[PDB]
Amino acid sequence: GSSGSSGEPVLCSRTTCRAVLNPLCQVDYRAKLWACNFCYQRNQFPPSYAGISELNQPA
């Protein structure tokens, strides 16, 4: 993980998209990269993805 105090919601890079990370997107745990289901853009995982239900919990 990453020390410090934070907890901002991961938002699709694309400014026009701004689609909050959803369980529908194509998550490539292997390449730690989840592509968007709408804009279809690859995004990098956040620094702190431990206290996240979307990830921790199954789709």
Query: Which residues sit in the known binding site for Zn(2+)?
Result: 12, 17, 36, 39
C-beta closer to Zn ion: residue 3 or 45: 45
Binding site for Zn ion (CB under 5 A): 12, 14, 17, 19, 36, 39
| Binding annotation | 12, 17, 36, 39
C-beta closer to Zn ion: residue 6 or 40: 40
Q: What number of CA atoms fall less than 13 Å from residue 22's CA on the CB side?
A: 11
CB of 38 to Zn ion, least distance (A): 5
User: By the 8 A CB rule, do 39 and 26 touch?
Assistant: no
- Burial label, 32 (beta-carbon count in 10 A; 0-12, 13-18, 19+): exposed
